[PDB]
Design a protein around this ligand. Structure first.
Ligand SMILES: Nc1ncnc2c1ncn2[C@@H]1O[C@H](COP(=O)(O)OP(=O)(O)O)[C@@H](O)[C@H]1O
Ligand SMILES: Nc1ncnc2c1ncn2[C@@H]1O[C@H](COP(=O)(O)OP(=O)(O)O)[C@@H](O)[C@H]1O
Lengths: 251, 290, 290, 251
């Protein structure tokens, strides 16, 4: 039914309008762009007195981390908006609406991620255009967009399932911040101690939370075949579980 | 919209017990009951918010449902026109400018149609909720206590407008609310709920209304007055706590007062008035209430 | 308890303009206006949450104040008895079993005093809100729509219980509410708020001259009945052709018909015409509404 | 006024009663105690294979870390309870109740911190009784109690001021977690890089947030005079600002 398809598209479009309309998005964008430009200009142009050579790995990593954490907060807010306002019980009438609701949430997640990748492209492109140095590559920017898609998609579906189960908003925000920042912080201070450290360190290459969050600081994203397959499988499993629970939950 | 053999229970307490319902040649139906008997549970069962009700609800997929439950749900941050347009696109077939303008003009929302929802009052939010519910262009429109914060004139205006809508377009209305004098204004049939069952089904279509007479006297004498009027004339209803005895319409008070004089008891207040659903409601449910 | 020269502005919207208010030899007062005129704002200013009054409010510190505004405030995860006890110890002087027990049986919350507030309905929460507000043992009660979710029998018992505590304990009540037929059962005076200032104050006990009581008697008995009524009470208008004499409204018919039954007089009919608060509201508000 | 004193003490007593009567409080204690006991038995009693000697600094630091992040979240929940249910309108009526309210909240903060310090003392003492090693000192436990008190009190008053200004609950929970975990995470990956790193590293010893979070995971702690002056003066200024804001806000 294309009527249902248009109903899905109108929901993603209005969610996008609300995001593009709120002033916090342009305040967050102003702060991140100002901070990245200030840090890059002060750090690259004076600490070793070269002939204005700038390396782009630090700006790449910093812009990736800041834009990713801001986009994550924007995504969690978008996900928990309806549960915050209590209007969700109006969208939970029949089965086809509960399903179109989940489809629209996933499509909205994809569109927001694409928009943020485009934004990341604009800041790094203007920085490179203004300065001089060795330009990056288009294939790298495309695969960076893909990494944005997988990260945001994985965490958004996980947080959507948990907020559907619990119906509490303060927990979702605190859990998202905690989950993002606890594993890179805890790993150096604890893995090197045990006689079980090598084994646990090896197992951190397979826990999706641990390696997806860990590779954020790194300036390049490199995945093995098993790692790519397990991440895609986890997103698909989350989608099936979400569909099953949404079609049996009463609001 | 039909319900068949609905039985919903929460643990040991059972709230609804094998009910049936159908809109039979009636456009507006009122649901009347006490507090905590399961009225909102009934509306949630019809609308679709509850899946584990263990029964069968016969609704059609091509038919949309626009509803109002316990409290309005709206985007407080955004505007009224934004809310109307969003819920018209997401729930309805589209947005109609002339139709929306007609709704706004009839309801009287133009002065505050551009102001933020968080700046509204309770009556304004309730009116907006009534308009958003009718925004869906439903075939069945169901309301959970529609008149929470409105002045008498506003309630009269909204009721007149809903009647003009249910007659210009083919709509079937369910309204569950107290304040029965407002209920008798727009309703075709009333159903009475106690312990999960429909005990009574009173149907009112025309304004003949069956005029009746009220005699008020204290309880210790009320027994004798009820016995006397049942032994002479035919009596319809009694309220024991207030000492209200409602015999049929009598033009001449002479035979009643003369008999009460040789009986030596006398009334504090005697009157003749139009019968109502408020009277019917007290008749069905004072056995449980008092 | 006095309010003097209050003006409050929200941006460019002026809500209050130099209002005076005073409790003069009255215990229960009613506040009446339209939707969004600023009645709860006046209540909130007299209560104390808002700080920028720009005028004078005279409140003694020894007097306690209890209130209920727009929504009940309770602890959802905890039980009702815990809520009553906590707000009695924290806001009131303490907790006493006899006083709370009398409140609980009269209000009617014994079966559900041990259930969780999360499972309550809206009317259940409003009754709990009135009881928690009364737990403070206040000198002033400020209630905002106390009966907007309750059944009629519930409205009568709660207002009668409120009046009983008004006489048993020196209490002053301020009530703002619609549904004027419910307000008129227990109230002494009403004040009308319109366009930000007080305009009319109506004392119901003293009445208006328009109230009449019509008694019809036989033609042969007319002279003797008229003689007795002319001796005893006041006559306003007399018309022999209709046979109707207009006298002041009297609430009890016992002594009057007792005297006529003692003088062998049996009236054909009796009834009274009076003007209510709905009539007063429409007459005052038709200047801007009609 | 002794009557007002009774009103404040009744509110603090009931706040403590609500803390002591929840299943999450004991779920948290059982989880933290089980994790610490499991970690100590698994790693301290068998690495180099001594005569089961255990060094208590790592266990001290780990117990302090878990208990601090749990006591902080219990404090944020305690301070945000009234804004969550919206019953705060009933308490912010007259100036005398509004000030007794703030005093009662401060006393509640003091008692919760003391209770958690006692919990830390009992768990570590049972662990020390069970295992083998060199015992710690009571002077260490009393100064540790002071550190628990100062840290928890500081963050609770700051979050109370922010929650008063904003009237949003998700932001407070996210901001609390954010302030605890961002500074130790950002400093190694960014501070050692610049020609301004030494200056910022030295200035990290004067920002209260910065040195309290750096010193939170340490197993030893001795303060300087400037740190004591700044922390106590900051505590006094936040209390005065809180009182001033509470007497001018309108709901
Ligand atoms: N989880 C629940 N949610 C709502 N109501 C519940 C729940 N569990 C039990 N009930 C009971 O069902 C009864 C009917 O509630 P409700 O439909 O809200 O009010 P009413 O019947 O007055 O419209 C209430 O007395 C309530 O105690
Ligand atoms: N944040 C606000 N604070 C105070 N008044 C407001 C606010 N937002 C809107 N108002 C105005 O308050 C008026 C109604 O005030 P109020 O007394 O609260 O409700 P009511 O009069 O319906 O009881 C409206 O005209 C509205 O414009």
């Amino acid at each position: 039914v294309p009527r249902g398809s248009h109903r899905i598209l109108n929901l993603v479009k209005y969610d996008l309008y609300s995001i593009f309309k709120s002033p916090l998005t342009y305040l967050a964008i102003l702060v991140v762009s100002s901070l990245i430009a200030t840090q890059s200009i002060l750090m690259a142009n004076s600490m070793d007195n070269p002939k204005h050579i700038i390396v782009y790995g630090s700006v790449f990593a910093a812009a990736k981390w800041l834009l990713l954490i801001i986009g994550l907060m924007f995504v969690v807010k978008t996900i928990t908006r309806d549960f915050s306002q209590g209007t969700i019980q109006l969208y939970m009438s029949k089965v086809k609406t509960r399903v179109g609701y989940i489809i629209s949430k996933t499509i909205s997640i994809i569109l927001i991620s694409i928009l943020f990748a485009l934004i990341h492209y604009v800041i790094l492109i203007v920085v490179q255009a203004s300065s001089n140095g060795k330009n990056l590559a288009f294939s790298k920017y495309v695969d960076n967009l893909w990494f944005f898609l997988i990260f945001l998609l994985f965490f958004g579906l996980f947080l959507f399932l948990i907020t559907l189960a619990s119906q509490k908003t303060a927990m979702i925000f605190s859990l998202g911040v905690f989950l993002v920042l606890i594993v890179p912080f805890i790993k150096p201070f604890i893995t090197f101690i045990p006689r079980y450290g090598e084994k646990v360190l090896d197992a951190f290459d397979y826990i999706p939370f641990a390696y997806l969050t860990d590779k954020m600081i790194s300036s390049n994203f490199d995945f093995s075949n098993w790692q790519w397959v397990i991440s895609l499988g986890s997103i698909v499993i989350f989608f099936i579980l979400n569909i099953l629970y949404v079609a049996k939950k009463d609001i | 919209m039909k319900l068949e053999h609905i039985t919903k229970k929460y643990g040991s307490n059972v709230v609804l017990n094998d009910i049936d319902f159908d809109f039979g040649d009636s456009r507006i139906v009122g649901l009347i009951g006490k507090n905590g008997v399961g009225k909102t549970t009934v509306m949630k069962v019809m609308n679709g918010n509850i899946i584990k009700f263990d029964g069968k609800v016969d609704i059609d997929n091509a038919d949309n449902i626009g509803f109002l439950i316990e409290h309005p749900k709206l985007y407080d941050n955004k505007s009224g026109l934004y809310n109307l347009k969003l819920f018209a696109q997401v729930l309805g077939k589209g947005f109609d400018k002339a139709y929306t303008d007609k709704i706004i003009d009839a309801f009287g929302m133009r002065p505050y149609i551009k102001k933020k929802v968080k700046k509204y009052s309770m009556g304004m939010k309730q009116k907006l909720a009534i308009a958003v519910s009718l925004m869906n262009k439903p075939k069945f429109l169901i309301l959970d206590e529609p008149t929470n914060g409105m002045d008498p004139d506003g309630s009269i205006d909204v009721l007149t407008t809903i009647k003009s809508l249910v007659n210009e377009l083919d709509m079937r209305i369910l309204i569950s609310s107290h304040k029965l004098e407002d209920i008798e204004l727009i309703c075709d049939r009333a159903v009475f709920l106690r312990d999960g069952h429909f005990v009574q089904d009173v149907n009112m279509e025309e304004g003949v209304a069956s005029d009746t007479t009220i005699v008020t006297v204290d309880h210790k004498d009320f027994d004798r007055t009820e016995k006397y009027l049942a032994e002479h004339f035919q009596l319809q209803n009694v309220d024991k706590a207030d000492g209200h005895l409602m015999i049929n319409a009598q033009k001449n008070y002479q035979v009643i007062l003369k008999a009460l004089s040789e009986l030596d008891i006398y009334p504090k207040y005697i009157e003749t008035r139009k019968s109502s659903l408020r009277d019917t409601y007290f008749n069905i449910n004072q056995r449980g209430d008092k």
